[PDB]
PDB file of C-alpha atoms in Angstrom:
ATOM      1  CA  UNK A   1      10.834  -3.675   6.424  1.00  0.00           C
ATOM      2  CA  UNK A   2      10.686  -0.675   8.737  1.00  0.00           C
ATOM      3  CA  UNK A   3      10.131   3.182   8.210  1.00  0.00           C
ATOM      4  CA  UNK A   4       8.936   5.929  10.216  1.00  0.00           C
ATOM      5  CA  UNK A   5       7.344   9.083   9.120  1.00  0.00           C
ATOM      6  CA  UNK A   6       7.683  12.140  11.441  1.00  0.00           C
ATOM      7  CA  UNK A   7       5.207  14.927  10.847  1.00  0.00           C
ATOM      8  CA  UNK A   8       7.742  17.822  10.793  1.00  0.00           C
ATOM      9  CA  UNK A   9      11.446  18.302   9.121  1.00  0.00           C
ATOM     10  CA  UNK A  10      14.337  16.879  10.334  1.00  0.00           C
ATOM     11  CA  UNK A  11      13.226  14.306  12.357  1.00  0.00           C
ATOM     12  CA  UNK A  12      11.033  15.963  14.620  1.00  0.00           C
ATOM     13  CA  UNK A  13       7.458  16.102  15.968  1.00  0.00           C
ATOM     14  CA  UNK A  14       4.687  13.729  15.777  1.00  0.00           C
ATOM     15  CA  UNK A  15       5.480  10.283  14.296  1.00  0.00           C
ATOM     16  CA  UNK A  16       4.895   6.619  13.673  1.00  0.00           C
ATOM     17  CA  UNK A  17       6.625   3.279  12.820  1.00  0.00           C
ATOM     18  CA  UNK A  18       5.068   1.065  10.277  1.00  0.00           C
ATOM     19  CA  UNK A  19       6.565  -2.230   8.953  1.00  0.00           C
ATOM     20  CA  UNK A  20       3.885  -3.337   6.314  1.00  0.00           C
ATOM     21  CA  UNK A  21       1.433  -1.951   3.368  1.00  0.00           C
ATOM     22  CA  UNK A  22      -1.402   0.255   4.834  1.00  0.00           C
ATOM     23  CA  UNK A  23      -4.157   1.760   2.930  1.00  0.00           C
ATOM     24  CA  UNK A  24      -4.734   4.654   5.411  1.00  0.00           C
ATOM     25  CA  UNK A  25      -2.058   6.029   7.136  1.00  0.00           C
ATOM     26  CA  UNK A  26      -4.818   8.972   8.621  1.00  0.00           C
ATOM     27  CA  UNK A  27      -5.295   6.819  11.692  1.00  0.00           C
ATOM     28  CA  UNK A  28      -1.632   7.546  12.795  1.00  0.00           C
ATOM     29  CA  UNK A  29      -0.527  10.977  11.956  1.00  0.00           C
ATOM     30  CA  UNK A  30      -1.298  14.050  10.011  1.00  0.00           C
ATOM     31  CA  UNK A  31       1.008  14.850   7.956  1.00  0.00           C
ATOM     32  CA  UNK A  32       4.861  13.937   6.683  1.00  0.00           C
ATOM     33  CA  UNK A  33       8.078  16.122   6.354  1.00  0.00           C
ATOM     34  CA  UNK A  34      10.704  13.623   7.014  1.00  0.00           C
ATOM     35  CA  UNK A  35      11.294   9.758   6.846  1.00  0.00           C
ATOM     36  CA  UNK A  36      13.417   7.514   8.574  1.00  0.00           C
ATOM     37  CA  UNK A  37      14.000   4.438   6.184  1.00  0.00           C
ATOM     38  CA  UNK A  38      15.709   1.429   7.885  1.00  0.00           C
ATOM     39  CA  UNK A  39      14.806  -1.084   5.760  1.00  0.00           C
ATOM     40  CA  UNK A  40      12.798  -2.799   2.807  1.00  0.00           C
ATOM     41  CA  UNK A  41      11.679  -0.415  -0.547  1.00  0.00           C
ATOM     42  CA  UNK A  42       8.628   1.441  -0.007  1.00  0.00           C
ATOM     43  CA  UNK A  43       6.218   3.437  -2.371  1.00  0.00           C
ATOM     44  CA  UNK A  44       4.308   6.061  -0.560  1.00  0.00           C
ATOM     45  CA  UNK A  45       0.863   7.800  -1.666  1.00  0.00           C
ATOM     46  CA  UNK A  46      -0.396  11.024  -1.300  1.00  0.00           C
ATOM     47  CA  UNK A  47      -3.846   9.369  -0.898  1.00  0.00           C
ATOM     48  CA  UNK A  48      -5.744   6.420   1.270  1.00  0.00           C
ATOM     49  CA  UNK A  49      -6.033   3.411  -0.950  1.00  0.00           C
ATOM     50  CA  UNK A  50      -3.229   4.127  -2.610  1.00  0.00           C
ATOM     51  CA  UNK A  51      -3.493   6.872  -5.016  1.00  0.00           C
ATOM     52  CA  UNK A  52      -2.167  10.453  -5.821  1.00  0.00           C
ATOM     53  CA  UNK A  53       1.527  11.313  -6.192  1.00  0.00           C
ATOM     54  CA  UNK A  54       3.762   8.298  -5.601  1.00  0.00           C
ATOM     55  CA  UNK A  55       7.076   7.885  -4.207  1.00  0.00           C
ATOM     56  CA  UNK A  56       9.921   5.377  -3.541  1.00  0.00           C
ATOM     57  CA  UNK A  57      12.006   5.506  -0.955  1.00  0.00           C
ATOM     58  CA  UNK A  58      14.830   2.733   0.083  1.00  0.00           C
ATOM     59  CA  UNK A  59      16.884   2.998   3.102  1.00  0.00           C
ATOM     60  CA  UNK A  60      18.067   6.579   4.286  1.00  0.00           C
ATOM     61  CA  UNK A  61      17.592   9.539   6.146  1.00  0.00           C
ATOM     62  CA  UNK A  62      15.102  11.848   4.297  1.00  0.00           C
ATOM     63  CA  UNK A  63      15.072  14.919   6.299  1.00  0.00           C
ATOM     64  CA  UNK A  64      12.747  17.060   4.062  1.00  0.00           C
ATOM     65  CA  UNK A  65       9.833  15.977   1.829  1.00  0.00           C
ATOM     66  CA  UNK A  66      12.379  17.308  -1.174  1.00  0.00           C
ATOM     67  CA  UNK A  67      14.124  14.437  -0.494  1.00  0.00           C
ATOM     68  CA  UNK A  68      11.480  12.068  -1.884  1.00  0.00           C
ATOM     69  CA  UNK A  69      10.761  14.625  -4.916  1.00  0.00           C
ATOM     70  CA  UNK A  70       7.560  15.219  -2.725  1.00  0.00           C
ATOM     71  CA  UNK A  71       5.026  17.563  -4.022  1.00  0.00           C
ATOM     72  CA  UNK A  72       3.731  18.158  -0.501  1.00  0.00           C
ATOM     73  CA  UNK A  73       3.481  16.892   2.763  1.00  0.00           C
ATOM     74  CA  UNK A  74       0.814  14.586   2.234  1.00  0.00           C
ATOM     75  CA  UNK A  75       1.683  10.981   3.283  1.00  0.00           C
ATOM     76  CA  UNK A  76      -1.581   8.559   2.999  1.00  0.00           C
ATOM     77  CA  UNK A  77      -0.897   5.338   2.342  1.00  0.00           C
ATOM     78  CA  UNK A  78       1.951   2.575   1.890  1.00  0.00           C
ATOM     79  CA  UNK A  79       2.988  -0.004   0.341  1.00  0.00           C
ATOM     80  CA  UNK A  80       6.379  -2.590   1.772  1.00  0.00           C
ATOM     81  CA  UNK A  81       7.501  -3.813  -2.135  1.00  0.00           C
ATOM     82  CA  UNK A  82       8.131  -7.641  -2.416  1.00  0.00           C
ATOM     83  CA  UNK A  83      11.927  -8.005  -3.045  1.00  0.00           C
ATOM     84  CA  UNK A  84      12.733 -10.110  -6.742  1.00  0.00           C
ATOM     85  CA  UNK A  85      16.067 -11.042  -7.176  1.00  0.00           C
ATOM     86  CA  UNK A  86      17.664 -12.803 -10.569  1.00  0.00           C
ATOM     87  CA  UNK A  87      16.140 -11.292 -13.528  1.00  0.00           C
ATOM     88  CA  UNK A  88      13.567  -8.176 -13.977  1.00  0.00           C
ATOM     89  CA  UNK A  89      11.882  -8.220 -16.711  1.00  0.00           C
ATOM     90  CA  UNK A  90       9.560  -5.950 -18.524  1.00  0.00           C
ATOM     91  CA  UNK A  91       7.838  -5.413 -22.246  1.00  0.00           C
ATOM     92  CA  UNK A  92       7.693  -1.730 -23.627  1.00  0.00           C
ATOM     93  CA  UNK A  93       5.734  -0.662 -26.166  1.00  0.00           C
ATOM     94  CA  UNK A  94       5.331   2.185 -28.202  1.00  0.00           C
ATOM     95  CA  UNK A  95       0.947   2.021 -28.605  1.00  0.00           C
ATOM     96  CA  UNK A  96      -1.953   1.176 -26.765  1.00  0.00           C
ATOM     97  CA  UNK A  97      -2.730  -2.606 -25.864  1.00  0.00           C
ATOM     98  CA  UNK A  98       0.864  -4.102 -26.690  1.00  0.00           C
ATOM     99  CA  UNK A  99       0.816  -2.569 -29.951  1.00  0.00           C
ATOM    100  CA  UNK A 100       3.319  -0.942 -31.648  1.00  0.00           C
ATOM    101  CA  UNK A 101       7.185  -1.917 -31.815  1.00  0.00           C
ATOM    102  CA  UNK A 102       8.113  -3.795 -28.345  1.00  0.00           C
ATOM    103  CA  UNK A 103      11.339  -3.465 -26.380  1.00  0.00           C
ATOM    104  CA  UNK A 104      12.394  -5.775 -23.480  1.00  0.00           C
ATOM    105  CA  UNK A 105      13.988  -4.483 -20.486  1.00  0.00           C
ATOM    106  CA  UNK A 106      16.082  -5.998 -18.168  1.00  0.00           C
ATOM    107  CA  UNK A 107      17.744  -4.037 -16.416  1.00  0.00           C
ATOM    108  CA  UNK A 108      17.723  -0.130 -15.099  1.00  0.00           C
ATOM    109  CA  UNK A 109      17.540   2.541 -17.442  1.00  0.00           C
ATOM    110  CA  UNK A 110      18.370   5.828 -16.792  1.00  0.00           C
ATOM    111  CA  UNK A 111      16.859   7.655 -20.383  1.00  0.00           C
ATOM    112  CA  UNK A 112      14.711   5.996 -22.734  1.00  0.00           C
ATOM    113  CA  UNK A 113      15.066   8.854 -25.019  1.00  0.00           C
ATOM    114  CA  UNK A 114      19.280   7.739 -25.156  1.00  0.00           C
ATOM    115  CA  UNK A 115      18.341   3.904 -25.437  1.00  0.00           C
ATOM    116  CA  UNK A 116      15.481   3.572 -27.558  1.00  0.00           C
ATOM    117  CA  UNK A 117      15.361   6.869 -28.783  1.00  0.00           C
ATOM    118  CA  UNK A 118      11.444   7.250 -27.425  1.00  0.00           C
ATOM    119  CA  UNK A 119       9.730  10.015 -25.540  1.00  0.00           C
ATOM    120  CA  UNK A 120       6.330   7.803 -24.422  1.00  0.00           C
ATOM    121  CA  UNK A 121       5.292   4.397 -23.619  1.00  0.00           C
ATOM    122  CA  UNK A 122       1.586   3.758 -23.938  1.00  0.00           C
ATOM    123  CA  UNK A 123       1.808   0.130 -22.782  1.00  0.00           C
ATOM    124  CA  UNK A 124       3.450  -2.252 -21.222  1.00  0.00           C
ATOM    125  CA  UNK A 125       3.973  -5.645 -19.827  1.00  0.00           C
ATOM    126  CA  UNK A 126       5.753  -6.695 -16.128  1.00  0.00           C
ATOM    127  CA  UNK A 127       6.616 -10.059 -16.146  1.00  0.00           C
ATOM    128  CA  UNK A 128       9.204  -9.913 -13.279  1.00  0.00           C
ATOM    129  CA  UNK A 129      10.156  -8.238 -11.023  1.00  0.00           C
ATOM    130  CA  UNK A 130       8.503  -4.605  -9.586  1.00  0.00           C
ATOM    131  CA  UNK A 131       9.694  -1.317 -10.870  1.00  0.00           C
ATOM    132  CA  UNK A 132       9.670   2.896 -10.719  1.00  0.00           C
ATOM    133  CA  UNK A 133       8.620   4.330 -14.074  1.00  0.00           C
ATOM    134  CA  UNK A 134      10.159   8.037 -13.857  1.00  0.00           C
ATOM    135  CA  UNK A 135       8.957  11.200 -16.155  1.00  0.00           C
ATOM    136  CA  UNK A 136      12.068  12.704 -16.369  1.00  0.00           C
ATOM    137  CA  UNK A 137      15.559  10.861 -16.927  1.00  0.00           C
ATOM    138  CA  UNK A 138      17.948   9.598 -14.315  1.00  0.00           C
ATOM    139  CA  UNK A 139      15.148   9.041 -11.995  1.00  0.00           C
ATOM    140  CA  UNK A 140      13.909  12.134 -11.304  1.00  0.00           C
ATOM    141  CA  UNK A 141      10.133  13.629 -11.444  1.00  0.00           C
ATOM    142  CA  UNK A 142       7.287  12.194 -11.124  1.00  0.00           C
ATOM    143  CA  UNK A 143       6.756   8.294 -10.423  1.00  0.00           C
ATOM    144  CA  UNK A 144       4.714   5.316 -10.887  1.00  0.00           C
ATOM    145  CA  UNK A 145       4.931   1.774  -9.202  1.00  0.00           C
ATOM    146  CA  UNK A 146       5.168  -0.877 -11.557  1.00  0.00           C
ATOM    147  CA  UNK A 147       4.146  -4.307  -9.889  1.00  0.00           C
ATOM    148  CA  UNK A 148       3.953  -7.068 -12.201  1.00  0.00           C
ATOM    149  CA  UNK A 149       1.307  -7.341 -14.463  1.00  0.00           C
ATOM    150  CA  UNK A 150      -0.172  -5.502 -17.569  1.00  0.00           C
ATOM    151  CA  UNK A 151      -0.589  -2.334 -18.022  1.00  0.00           C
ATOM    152  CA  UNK A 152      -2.336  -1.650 -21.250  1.00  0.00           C
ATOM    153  CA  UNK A 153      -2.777   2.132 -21.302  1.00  0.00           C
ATOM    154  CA  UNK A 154      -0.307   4.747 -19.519  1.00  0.00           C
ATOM    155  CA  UNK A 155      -3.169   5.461 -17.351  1.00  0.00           C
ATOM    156  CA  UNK A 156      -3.091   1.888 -15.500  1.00  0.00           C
ATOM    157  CA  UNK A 157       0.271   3.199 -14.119  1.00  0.00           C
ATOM    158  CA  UNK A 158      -1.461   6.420 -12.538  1.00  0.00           C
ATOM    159  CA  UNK A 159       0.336   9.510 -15.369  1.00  0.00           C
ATOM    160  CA  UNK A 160      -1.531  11.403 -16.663  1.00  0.00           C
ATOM    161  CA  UNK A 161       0.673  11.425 -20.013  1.00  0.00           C
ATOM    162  CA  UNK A 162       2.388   8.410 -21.360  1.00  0.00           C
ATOM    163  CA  UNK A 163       5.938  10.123 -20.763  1.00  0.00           C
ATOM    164  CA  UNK A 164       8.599   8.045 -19.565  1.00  0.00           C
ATOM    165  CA  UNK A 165      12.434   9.526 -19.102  1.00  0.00           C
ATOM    166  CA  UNK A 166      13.363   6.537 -17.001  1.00  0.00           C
ATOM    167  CA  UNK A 167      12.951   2.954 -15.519  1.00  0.00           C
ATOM    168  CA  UNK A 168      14.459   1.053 -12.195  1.00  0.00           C
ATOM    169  CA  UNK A 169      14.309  -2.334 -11.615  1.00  0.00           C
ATOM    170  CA  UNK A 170      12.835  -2.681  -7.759  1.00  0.00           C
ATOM    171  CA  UNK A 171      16.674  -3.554  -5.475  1.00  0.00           C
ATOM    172  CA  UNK A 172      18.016  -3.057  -2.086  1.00  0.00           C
TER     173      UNK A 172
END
């Protein structure tokens, strides 16, 4: 993988070239208004280690932090995601601790709400595969990396709220 963050718009200003996960991105620049994707699936964090606002990005030109849904220009951390191929799989379900009525997932899905007619997930379990939980449908809002594993409460994913408009399997 390969990306490069440049501290102002449009490709311009102070920048750097990473090709791997880094906890603290501080040591190399400032700040991030654009991003130069050339390959492998990324999430970015607001914050060192990994936390605050997160954001995937695949390959493209992102001239403007609007481009990532960004919430600012705060660009702290990194992670390269591994690349699964054959079949994703997840477990949804609708309370705490795998609780609750469970749905399997397979594949992308671009409103919850229109497939299983649910506004919230308050668990759930990756068993293949990583993912991008979205608030809003069609992949839009705010998002959360979903690396396999369990995630027993919404707050192991990083929301705030257990709201969940839509889900994308991890591809190139």
């Amino acid at each position: 993988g390969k990306i490069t963050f440049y501290e102002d718009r449009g490709f311009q200003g102070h920048c750097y070239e990473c090709s791997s996960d880094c906890p603290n991105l501080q040591p190399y620049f400032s700040r991030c208004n654009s991003i130069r994707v050339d390959s492998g699936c990324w999430m970015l964090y607001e914050r060192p280690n990994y936390q605050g606002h997160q954001y995937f990005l695949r390959r493209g030109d992102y001239p403007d932090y609007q481009q990532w849904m960004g919430f600012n220009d705060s660009i702290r951390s990194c992670r390269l995601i591994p690349q699964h191929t054959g079949t994703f799989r997840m477990r949804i379900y609708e309370r705490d601790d795998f609780r609750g009525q469970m749905s399997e997932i397979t594949d992308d899905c671009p409103s919850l709400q229109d497939r299983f007619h649910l506004t919230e997930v308050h668990s759930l379990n990756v068993l293949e595969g990583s993912w991008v939980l979205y608030e809003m449908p069609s992949y839009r809002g705010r998002q959360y990396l979903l690396r396999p594993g369990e995630y027993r409460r919404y707050l192991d994913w990083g929301a705030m709220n257990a709201k969940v408009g839509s889900l994308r399997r991890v591809m190139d």
